[PDB]
A paper describes a structure:
Of them, the most active variants, αsA1 (C258L-I261F-W263A), αsA6 (F46L-C258A-W263M-I280T), αsB5 (V27A-I76T-Y97W-Y99F-L130P-L226V), αsC6 (L72I-Y99F-I122L-L228M-F229S-W263L), and αsD6 (V27A-Y97W-L228M-W263M) were subject to kinetic and structural characterization. Although the active sites of the improved variant structures superpose well onto the wt-structure, all selected mutants display altered loop 8 conformations. Notably, mutant αsA6 was crystallized in two different conformations: one in which loop 8 adopts a wt-like conformation, referred to as closed conformation (CC), and another one where loop 8 is unfolded, referred to as open conformation (OC). Interestingly, variants αsA6 and αsC6 exhibit enhanced lactonase activity against γ- and δ-lactones, while αsA1, αsB5 and αsD6 show reduced lactonase catalytic efficiencies. This emphasizes the fact that the improvement of the phosphotriesterase activity does not necessarily compromise the cognate, lactonase activity of the enzyme.
Author numbering:
A (entry chain B), B (entry chain A): 1 to 314
Amino acid sequence: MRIPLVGKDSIESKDIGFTLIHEHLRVFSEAVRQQWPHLYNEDEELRNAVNEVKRAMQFGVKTIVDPTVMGLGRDIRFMEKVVKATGINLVAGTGIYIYIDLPFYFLNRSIDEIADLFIHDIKEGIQGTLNKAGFVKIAADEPGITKDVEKVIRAAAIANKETKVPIITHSNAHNNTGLEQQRILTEEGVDPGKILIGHLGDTDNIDYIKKIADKGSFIGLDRYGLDLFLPVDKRNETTLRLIKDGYSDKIMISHDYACTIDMGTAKPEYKPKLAPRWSTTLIFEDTIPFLKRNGVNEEVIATIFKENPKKFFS
Amino acid sequence: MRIPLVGKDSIESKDIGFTLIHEHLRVFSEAVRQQWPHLYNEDEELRNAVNEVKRAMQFGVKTIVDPTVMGLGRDIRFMEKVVKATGINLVAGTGIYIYIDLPFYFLNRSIDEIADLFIHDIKEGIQGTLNKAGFVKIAADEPGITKDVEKVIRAAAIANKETKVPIITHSNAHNNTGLEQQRILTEEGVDPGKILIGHLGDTDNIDYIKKIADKGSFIGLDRYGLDLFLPVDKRNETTLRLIKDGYSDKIMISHDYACTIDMGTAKPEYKPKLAPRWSTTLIFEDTIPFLKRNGVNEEVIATIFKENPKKFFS
Ligand SMILES: [Co+2]
Ligand SMILES: [Co+2]
Ligand SMILES: [Fe+2]
Ligand SMILES: [Fe+2]
């Protein structure tokens, strides 16, 4: 009993099993949903999330880590409903997802006050329940490391030092944000092995990805199916390359699938190859078979999906 | 009839009576309240709002216009509870309050889609209730007129053209944002007299304030009690000067009081004269007595608090 689970007793990290480290049951903008509930259907969202999780479990997924936090519409009671319907081990997190500035609430507030919110969710529970957070999620993207983005990073480091939960990040693979997150966190005393630098699979710049892995953090090849960021074939070649080059013990793989997401849909792009179905199981249908074909053995798969998450949460 | 009221049948605009055009029963950041409910106490908030409204009614206020919208924590059911407890005429609005970018929901979405949300609230109702919006609120501040800020302004113009409800703005008195809002709205076909340009009382630059009034819009001397923006004495002198200069028929006065607000507390500033009590009734205690004793007659008061709101909502 060391990793808290939604709707269940906590488990030992050694028992996490086959894990999807970055998937979302549901994402929404809190303010839009509060103000215009007519745009949403929680029953449909629930059905969709339950079906996705069930499909993941039939491929052998034991645990799903869901980094939906403030800014992405975290709802612990929705998450509980999915657990009740499926029996999945679900790890919820705390944190703040922003690209530029914090909400107005945080005007005249300290990094310590921010960290206290995270620690509340880890030690006391999330949204008035006894379901506790098992990691912290932070973000940076195109705007880079702004002052408020940096405040949140520093607050995450405080929470990690106090509670030992790991940190998952969102970064932009093309502007060094991930490298900066890793640097700031490690400067503040976070173990590099307690950090997953996200969305590195969005680039085929292997020198950049290795640089981060070499500094001791997990690398998030974590958006399989999101072709608009990087097509599955190029992701697969990069993943294969990294495996070939000895990086299995730093690689984490996921889809960043949002079973439902409320953002406007971007212009389709059509390529010669039929578009992969983005879902929580695309890796079982495409990536893993591809790897196996190219001689990747079962031990690599176990390393990426079992041993790495076990270490991350240890 | 014509102006929709929370928890009541609509009223004719001629029957609006003595109005406070810009007051907030409660403000909060939607995402923070959803994620960390431990920080908030709705029962305390309700008590505080009810007491403030009762005190306003004791001074003869008939109608309060509350421009809490998306970004400020609009909650129509909370508003209904205040009406039930007090009997106030309360005008709720729709709109979006942002300074830089829209929520992620709006990625890949059109100005028309944004306007449709406003029109839904005006024609159908707010948050799943039959309480309808009676105006649109928009904002700009230190970052100026960004592309997303402009989208929201243009969406407000569409909603006004379709429904004839007026537009209230938030601006920064020191960087031309109010002038820009007025210009863009009027260019899009909004009657200048259907616009209240907010927070002009935050400056003593009378030339700037008059410029906006001369272009046909109401001018919001609307933050009485917020000394950190401009002290009450200086506001009073500016208000008096505008009256002396013949601007009564463009002046709107309010406090922008937030009966509760969740933002961190700014550093105190202490001045030689005791700080006035920022509340929903400060103008009865300070401003109005000051005006009358400097020779301002009852007809000016009636113009500012009754006739101007009547015209605005006509
Ligand atoms: Co992300
Ligand atoms: Co304002
Ligand atoms: Fe994600
Ligand atoms: Fe306001």
